[PDB]
Symmetry: D2
Subunit: 384 residues, 4 copies
């Protein structure tokens, strides 16, 4: 279960570089130079790395320092063959963003958020990124009177439209991917789920430039089914990128390594990504637990890729098994894929077998055989 | 705090008529004749009533029985002055819908679900309903292999498109409102939140014919903020109807009376509905607890309306209070409502005050004053 | 992975016999005669069956009918070799228990609950049960003023003490096991978790006669860690029985088959039961989904046992693997098992290495190596 | 609604002194000198303040610095009349406690945790504290193999027993109060709820020296009912202290000001504390949101006390209202408080009215009248 470049495994600098500070605790690890992270990730088999502006160039850097940080990072990419498929802006750490970046009540802060984002889009394009993620972690509120949500959505649409106008004006090919999160750090965050983000994009001036970047743990923090949400994003043609990790139910964002947390949902997620032919990066946005030292960081990163590969094998074995294919037919998954009334409305209205002469009791008595199907899925996942 | 017709308070026959059966218990109340419910609700001050096909006409009724049930119900509406603003189809009780109505794996069941829905749309229009709700409570799954979600969304779009074609073909003015629910009775339900439902409608052939019918307790079962979701529905122009009740967090659907459950969210919800000028029915979809007898049913129904009216008074007093208006300005809610960059992209890019000369520390130091604002909101809610 | 009698797999009559009625749906399966269930379960490899009074003898049965129902059930046990290790009372279905059995506000109902329980304890002992479960599903409230909790705990202690006095007076060897549940059907249920139940037992007159019957899905409905709760019950010497099933997080009680839901928690649970040498029944309290017909019921029941057996194999392989034993030492699990200060308080107070000369930085720098350990656990669970 | 000394309102130095750092953000406020916090809290009407060792004396302080910090703090207490009723140890911030203090796998860390705790107990007693809180925020795990829970409970009992032996040996009158939390910062924390903590105390060598310090938001993070848990702690005689704040359901620990979050549960909590005659500190363990500046910190602290006082008034008005007293009788709360069978077991067994001649249907038909009672409670809370 060894990673290959074709696996398109990527990691954020902030994942393996997380120093272990939490709401109740100081750092447990020293900061990592991005150069070292790129070298270690490449040795593990990763194919790419992603960054926030402030992960790559320390906030408040001079132009000379900025150029030096980029130069060293570019050298590490060149030394390893690593790609930079995606970048994003830090609009959450600095205290100025305490009430948001794009939807801050203070208009001067909203303007500043856009200028900081635009500067980094230019850098992202220079490093070859195809996707630019927006995670509005500070957009939201802890109390009802603090944020009029319709006004905040107007400000959020305004900002995304300006960014769309900027990329179009520069002839860039980069597309945006909005990453939903339901809460944390704000009490409630705006566009809290993949559904809210999909609905919002359809009101933007150039919707084609935007998609979603769903994260396993985020949808799970709302107790939602992550593979279902990904299916709806795929159905919309909007799965531009994805963040893989684990989460143990409704609680704070744990960012466990992928495979940890809800193992069965990880299995059905990989089954769906592979069956649907998702072709973007398989990006891990996780945090090696603060209990770990540097050796445990790299073990945790390797485990993300290993788990994806084991799950890929088992889901492929499941779908290819003739006994599973027979069970899928027994459960009528083939009939779910056939149109309900390709004959048309009038034909349906005149079809007595659809109503007047439909034997509801006979239909009701037919078992769905879903448990047998699911135990074949469990046996394949466990290699039983 | 006495209801008036202008309050547009409505109730489902199945709410006050709920007999108290739960997963672990038999009925605690006798069935109510819809005629009696219409009479009692009208005496409490309600203005309208809603129904599923099977609440008004027992499933499997002959045409003569159907006509008789409707005749008596029409007489009660006429005797009381009560309206029927909304109706819906029962696509969840009968065992034939065990795997769904519109998204059942069995194609014959999907066709039957549409024929049952169409028959009731005709009746709804005859009774004067303006909104027809779809609640796909059986659409979903308990296991991963049982339902391919992209195929189910294709079947769901197909069904909604056929229904849109049917209402258009009859020249009806009725519009549809899809009611999201994240789970229960299925392990996970398709279109689980207001966001997913809004995003789905934008892929339908005639999106203008569809909106949402969000329910307080449903969004709260995903731990989401209900007033935020309603704000996004309003922002989209899609709040066609609403279901009001209470819920105590993430657990089974409690359907408490409105005002119970999360009282502060009820306050901010009524504040938003009234400020936004929502003009549809204020419909209660709740269940008087099974501990209650018939007298407690009517007390619970009256309490729904009373609570809405007390909250309406307190939210109006809050928004009208000059001290609150000053606090809103102190927290910059006025600046949230002003465009970020009406000057345009190029002007923003050339504005040094937005970046090069923006004093982030001075901006960061400015408190938002949200706690003072929220304690004024608490004082108004409590009449302190 | 075929069950043997030594596996002590048991099932409630109400599990495979569940007819599929839910809050929104009618039965999807015909009732099962307990005789048929005992025969089918025995054919699958189960070793025992459990019952509520009302599952075995229909509520309101005459003495002759009661004797006949018992006679046929005894014949089926004799025909199959099946055991009856545990029984319990239905104090939740009948409307008289709408506000509780032992803690009903109506005193006449509390007395009746005790008389109904006592009658069935006599029957349980006659059928050979060693454990009598109490699940106070109706003990609790939907509103604050409805139940004074200190008074309800007094009534609950009174009832358990009377039951303890009754078994002691008859010379029975049967012991009680209280099954916690946090909510559903009541908004909040009294003794909501294994901790609350353990604490309550320590205030009973004969605490030795009571233990707990924790259920996987119940603790998970509070988002608690089920193996941790079982560890605390074991630590207390109070794990008298256990209910095995699956649950997908915080939501209504799903009662999926064991292995479904949180698969990693099922793995750590079986690892703990086996390592601790738990010797009671491995009882499944689950509901085959209502999508299923009779064939799917038996497939679901078989899957419960299969999953327990696969997890038993993988956890045993994990603990026996020398590489895992080395990792456990690397993570200091051996040092967790050694007393902190067997040298005593004064020796600790005078030990400069414990404070004055303790190098906190050197200790802090040592990684815990938990991720490597956990990926060995994942590899064993998946057979990778 | 102005605080008085008799209200016993207290606050932790770390509450109003919280600098606003979160998992995704830097500090938004400068550190406060404890002297200033004591002065400001006293001006607001608080009566006492509490501390962790490391809030009062910076970690790694020399003896001279330690004495100076204490001297200035003692001067501020003397200048204001403020009390120090409770203290606790910081066993979570420093990286050495990354795997716990008392239950760290590393034995040297467990010894160090006890020595750090003992040093601060001496200081707490010198400052007049009556209660010493233990919050084992780092005791727990993110993965199954990392912590054997029975061994960790042995180590936890060992540590508490040594602390009990230490206070007894010094003749101190101080008692301990264990504060449960279900998760955060560890994936799952040991003794996750008030029930688990109560059960654990009953296994300690001197149980009389230990009680609980429940926190509103903590029990709510498990979706549990906080007033119910407090009722069980009161029933056990173990409510030694309490932490008051708000929380909006199951998610990360928000620590909102008291009254925010679940307002109805705050009402029933204050009703219970006052009716039961709880006589310990009404301590606020909350964090003014990081959106706020210093003025908003003091507004938030004042709001905690104001809300407690408004709720105290409304709950007292509720219990004193003759119409509410009549409703309580109508709902049989008086019968809940009467023994079920003071006549004894044999009298119950021979009482035909308890079984043979009990009319279950007549009893079942009696409504509980809980909705009318609850709407009187809502009307009192809102002053309607
Ligand atoms: O993906 C986002 C992540 O979830 C957050 O924690 O940091 C910003 C990243 O863009
Ligand atoms: O028993 C069921 C079978 O498993 C399924 O495949 O077809 C319907 C039948 O009723
Ligand atoms: O609004 C829906 C309700 O939530 C459900 O329980 O019954 C169908 C109704 O249409
Ligand atoms: O103190 C703050 C004030 O409350 C707000 O209104 O303006 C910013 C100031 O910094
Ligand atoms: O174990 C209990 C189960 O969880 C409940 O649903 O039925 C009573 C059983 O005793
Ligand atoms: O690297 C760590 C190792 O994995 C563990 O076993 O001992 C502490 C070391 O610091
Ligand atoms: O009460 C505890 C609080 O909940 C935690 O966050 O800090 C330690 C305090 O002792
Ligand atoms: O209607 C009910 C009344 O409200 C209660 O107080 O007594 C039982 C009666 O049945
Ligand atoms: Ca995350
Ligand atoms: Ca992410
Ligand atoms: Ca509902
Ligand atoms: Ca509804
Ligand atoms: Ca259950
Ligand atoms: Ca059970
Ligand atoms: Ca807290
Ligand atoms: Ca606390």
């Amino acid at each position: 279960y060894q990673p290959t470049p074709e696996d398109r495994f990527t990691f954020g600098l902030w994942t393996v570089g997380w120093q272990g500070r939490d709401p109740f605790g100081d750092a447990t690890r020293r900061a990592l130079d991005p150069v070292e992270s790129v070298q270690r990730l490449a040795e593990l088999g990763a194919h790419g790395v992603t960054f926030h502006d402030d992960d790559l160039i320390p906030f408040g850097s001079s132009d000379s320092e900025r150029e030096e940080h980029v130069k060293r990072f570019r050298q590490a990419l060149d030394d390893t063959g690593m790609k930079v498929p995606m970048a994003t802006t830090n609009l959450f750490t600095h205290p100025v963003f305490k009430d948001g970046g794009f939807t801050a009540n203070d208009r001067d802060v909203r303007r500043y958020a856009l200028r900081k984002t635009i500067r980094n889009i230019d850098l992202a394009v220079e490093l070859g990124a195809e996707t630019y993620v927006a995670w509005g972690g500070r957009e939201g509120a802890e109390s009802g009177g603090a944020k009029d949500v319709r006004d905040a959505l107007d400000r959020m649409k305004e900002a995304f439209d300006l960014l769309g106008e900027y990329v179009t004006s520069q002839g860039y090919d980069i597309r945006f991917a909005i990453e939903p999160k339901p809460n944390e750090p704000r009490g409630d965050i705006l566009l809290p789920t993949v559904g809210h983000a999909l609905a919002f994009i359809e009101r933007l001036e150039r919707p084609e430039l935007y998609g979603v970047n769903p994260e396993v743990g985020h949808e799970q923090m709302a107790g939602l089914n992550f593979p279902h949400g990904i299916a709806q994003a795929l159905w919309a043609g909007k799965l531009f990128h994805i963040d893989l990790n684990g989460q143990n139910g409704i609680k704070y964002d744990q960012d466990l390594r992928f495979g940890a947390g809800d193992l069965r949902a990880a299995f059905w997620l990989v089954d769906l990504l592979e069956s649907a032919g998702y072709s973007g990066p398989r990006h891990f946005d996780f945090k090696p637990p603060r209990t770990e030292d540097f050796d445990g960081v790299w073990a945790s990163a390797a485990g993300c890729m290993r788990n994806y590969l084991i799950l890929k094998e088992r889901a492929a074995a499941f779908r290819a098994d003739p006994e599973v294919q027979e069970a899928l037919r027994a459960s009528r998954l083939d009939e779910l894929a056939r149109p309900t009334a390709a004959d048309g409305l009038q034909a349906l209205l005149d079809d007595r077998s659809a109503f007047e002469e439909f034997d509801v009791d006979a239909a009701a008595a037919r078992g769905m055989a879903f448990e047998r199907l699911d135990q074949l899925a469990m046996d394949h996942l466990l290699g039983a």
